[PDB]
Ligand binder design. Structure first.
Ligand SMILES: *[C@@H]1O[C@H](CO)[C@@H](O)[C@H](O)[C@H]1NC(C)=O
Ligand SMILES: *[C@@H]1O[C@H](CO)[C@@H](O)[C@H](O)[C@H]1NC(C)=O
Ligand SMILES: *[C@@H]1O[C@H](CO)[C@@H](O)[C@H](O)[C@H]1NC(C)=O
Ligand SMILES: *[C@@H]1O[C@H](CO)[C@@H](O)[C@H](O)[C@H]1NC(C)=O
Ligand SMILES: [Zn+2]
Lengths: 596, 195
């Protein structure tokens, strides 16, 4: 028997063994997340530890089949994914040091506290304490105190750990034959050996930068309009030509500009579409909300939810003393077990979240027939892109009128359309320079292009130049402001939020064209379009079995990430912004700072 | 008026593992086949050659009842000309099969919280099964070229895998009890008529 035939048999044993071991761990994890007890924490760890130990053993055994002697690509994909050394290419000592470093950075982030001056007992955590300030406060000094204290007390603790974390991560990556840890992260987009669909790791840098250039005009005008509105609210704190102060952006980092809507809303006398009152007026409950979401996917030709979904999910807060982790999550436990965990309230937000979360379930169900290791999104940005387009359609006035929640006597006027697009842009567009700039900095640090004694100097140079945001207090190299965001101190790649954002409008535009939608893209509802559902399903069932370039082409007809649908979605706002900014300065000088 | 002992087959406490499928020879009795096909308790009742509709007007020399447990997605493999782990390694029907295949969901009996591992199936085998063949061997499967020495290790796998039957699995992964009725016709007494 050949090496390939041995690998097929080896993967055969792995799939059947992993399926049950993963199920045991998912089940234990579920019981803790819905019913928080000490016994459930231990059972979650024991099942989780066995699964991790199983993966470590099977990874070593997989490495004894060299990829060079395998021609069947679907075998090579599974073999390669299992074979990845990860941290296990380092010595046990280095591996142990790195794991200690990761846990300490995580613990500092989630337990880091800040106490107000003159009361060392009045202390706030990031969640909910500091986040409440950064999302709701209009007072300049309170916001500045929260922004600086978080970075000066918690960020400074992370600085030495992050320096050592980079060194060990780079050693791990170079031992795995990558250029550095950033090149390792970019490997999620790599495709080899499929003519016409290949994609190199370095090509991601070029494609992110190329598409970001086309985003700059829309962002510049979004930045200029926001700066003008804030300058009306804070005339003594904002320069008409300068960057936006970093603590005046709606959250701790300015990752999203969502919470600037109240001070920037174009037409403040036209109210939002808030369909919550109609839901309560009709006595909707959680089961109705998820039944409606199920009805939505069925209308495009996707299957209804399984019986186990309704029996085993937790669609409401359990309440009295059984405590649960209420963050909305879609669970693929394996063995045909699909569940949603969500503490649903009767609100429009949770109504849209259910469609989003059920979108994940539809994705999970569609690639269930794939081999275990290929049961995932085509790349790191696919799954979240699938979830986002579901809430795009479900939120439109057209869809809310067809399910009886929005009055037929509500008609769209262009002022509510500008209000909605501006609110969307604050979240969706505002995060794109933030996400690209943050990942560029980490890429350059891992690459070795930023020396340690210039980490924060470069971090704020790039914030000013690329994001148009300026720090309100000078920060020397004892700070580690990037690590003050969860994803950096918890070792998660970040470009996924950039690529997913472009993917979702590529998906939505393609699906809406299949749905024969007439009018602006942002008013599209793919409901009742089996043609759209079929086009999406053709990619969903692929899982990870095909190159992500091919999976994308199944939906949109193109092999690569494309920014044009994103600009098509926001075009009505773009023309309105350009007219608004006619007597404003557009762009920013980087040398102005609030500390003069 | 000797009634064929179908109750012992269908209403058994525990079914056999499919790799070790159970065979019950039925002889010298009266079988009321119409009770089964017109009971509406089974999810699969498909006959090949013979007709379920009132063909208890026939006589057969011997009737065999094969029973075992498989997951729902594998019930499709209990049919002539099918491939897959069950059809190739555990239980194989002939191309010219004359008989009926009966299956029902047994999640209420064969699933358990934490997992029921009583039922096994054969995952590896050097070759495919002849029709109506049974392999209950436990020889360690040699996937490579180095001898296994009777223990599992590199490229050496114990050939039988366990279903993990949990009540919360999807329908495709839930246990199903299967009964396969063979109708044999030899130039012989024809002892099972069953009006
Ligand atoms: C919560 O977990 C405990 C064991 O930790 C268990 O005895 C109890 O039945 C569970 N309650 C619910 C509602 O699941
Ligand atoms: C790869 O192997 C699987 C199963 O071993 C088979 O179904 C598939 O056709 C093979 N692909 C190629 C290109 O040989
Ligand atoms: C889903 O639809 C099928 C029909 O295709 C139906 O048989 C089944 O009962 C439905 N299940 C639910 C939970 O709606
Ligand atoms: C199994 O038991 C039920 C209830 O006692 C009975 O109706 C059924 O006929 C039995 N099965 C057979 C094959 O007789
Ligand atoms: Zn999501």
């Amino acid at each position: 028997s050949t090496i390939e035939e041995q690998a097929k048999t080896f993967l055969d044993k792995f799939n059947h063994e992993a399926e049950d071991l993963f199920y045991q761990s998912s089940l234990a994890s579920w019981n803790y997340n819905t019913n928080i007890t000490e016994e459930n924490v231990q059972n979650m760890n024991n099942a989780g530890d066995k699964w991790s130990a199983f993966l470590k053993e099977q990874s070593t055994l997989a490495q004894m089949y060299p990829l060079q002697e395998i021609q069947n690509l679907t075998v090579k994909l599974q073999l390669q994914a299992l074979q990845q050394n990860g941290s296990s290419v380092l010595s046990e000592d280095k591996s142990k040091r790195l794991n200690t470093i990761l846990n300490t950075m995580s613990t500092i982030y989630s337990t880091g506290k800040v106490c107000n001056p003159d009361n060392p007992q009045e202390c706030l955590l990031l969640e909910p304490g500091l986040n409440e300030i950064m999302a709701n406060s209009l007072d300049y000094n309170e916001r500045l105190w929260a922004w600086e204290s978080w970075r000066s007390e918690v960020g400074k603790q992370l600085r030495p750990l992050y320096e050592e974390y980079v060194v060990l991560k780079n050693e791990m990556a170079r031992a795995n034959h990558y250029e550095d840890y950033g090149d390792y992260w970019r490997g999620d987009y790599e495709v080899n050996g499929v003519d016409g669909y290949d994609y190199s790791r370095g090509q991601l840098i070029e494609d992110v930068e190329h598409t970001f250039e086309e985003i700059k005009p829309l962002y510049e005008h979004l930045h200029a309009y926001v700066r003008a509105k804030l300058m009306n609210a804070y005339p003594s704190y904002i320069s008409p030509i300068g960057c936006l102060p970093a603590h005046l952006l709606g959250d701790m980092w300015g990752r999203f500009w969502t919470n600037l809507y109240s001070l920037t809303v174009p037409f403040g006398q036209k109210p939002n579409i808030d369909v919550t009152d109609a839901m309560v007026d009709q006595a909707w409950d959680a089961q109705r909300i998820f039944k409606e979401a199920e009805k939505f996917f069925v209308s495009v030709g996707l299957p209804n939810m399984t019986q186990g979904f309704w029996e085993n999910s937790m669609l409401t807060d359990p309440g009295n003393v059984q405590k649960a982790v209420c963050h909305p999550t879609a669970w693929d436990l394996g063995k045909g077990d699909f569940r949603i965990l969500m503490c649903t309230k009767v609100t429009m937000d949770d109504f849209l979240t259910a469609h989003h979360e059920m979108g994940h379930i539809q994705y999970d169900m569609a690639y269930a027939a794939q081999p275990f290791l290929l049961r995932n999104g085509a790349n790191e940005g696919f799954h979240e892109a699938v979830g986002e387009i579901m809430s795009l359609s479900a939120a439109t006035p057209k869809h809310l009128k067809s399910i009886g929640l929005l009055s037929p006597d509500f008609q769209e006027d262009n002022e509510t359309e500008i209000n909605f697009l501006l609110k969307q842009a604050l979240t969706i567009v505002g995060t794109l320079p933030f996400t690209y700039m943050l990942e560029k900095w980490r890429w350059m640090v891992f690459k070795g292009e930023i020396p340690k004694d210039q980490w924060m100097k470069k971090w704020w140079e790039m914030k000013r130049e690329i994001v148009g945001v300026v720090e309100p207090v000078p920060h020397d190299e004892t700070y580690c402001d990037p690590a003050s965001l969860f994803h950096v101190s918890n070792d998660y790649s970040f470009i996924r939020y950039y690529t997913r954002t472009l993917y979702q409008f590529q998906f939505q535009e393609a699906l809406c064209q299949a749905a024969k939608h007439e009018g602006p893209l942002h008013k599209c509802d793919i409901s009742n379009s089996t043609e759209a559902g079929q086009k999406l399903f053709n990619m969903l069932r692929l899982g990870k079995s095909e190159p992500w370039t091919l999976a994308l082409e199944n939906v949109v007809g193109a092999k690569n990430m494309n920014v044009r649908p994103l600009l098509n979605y926001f075009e009505p706002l773009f023309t309105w912004l350009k007219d608004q900014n006619k007597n404003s300065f557009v762009g920013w000088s980087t040398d102005w700072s609030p500390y003069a | 008026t000797n009634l064929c002992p179908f109750g012992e087959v269908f209403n058994a406490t525990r079914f056999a593992s499919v790799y070790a499928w159970n065979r019950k020879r039925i002889s010298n009795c009266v079988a009321d086949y119409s009770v089964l096909y017109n009971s509406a308790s089974f999810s699969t009742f498909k006959c090949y050659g013979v007709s379920p509709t009132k063909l208890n007007d026939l006589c057969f020399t011997n009737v065999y009842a094969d029973s075992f447990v498989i997951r729902g997605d594998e019930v499709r493999q209990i049919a002539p000309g099918q491939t897959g782990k069950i059809a190739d390694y555990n239980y194989k029907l002939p191309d010219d099969f004359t008989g009926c295949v009966i299956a029902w969901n047994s999640n209420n009996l064969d699933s358990k919280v934490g997992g029921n591992y009583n039922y096994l199936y054969r995952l590896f085998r050097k070759s495919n099964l002849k029709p109506f063949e049974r392999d209950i061997s436990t020889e360690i499967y040699q996937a490579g070229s180095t001898p296994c020495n009777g223990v599992e290790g590199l490229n050496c796998y114990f050939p039988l895998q366990s279903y993990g039957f949990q009540p919360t699995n999807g329908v495709g992964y839930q246990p199903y009890r299967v009964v396969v009725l063979s109708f044999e016709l030899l130039h012989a007494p024809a002892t099972v008529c069953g009006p």
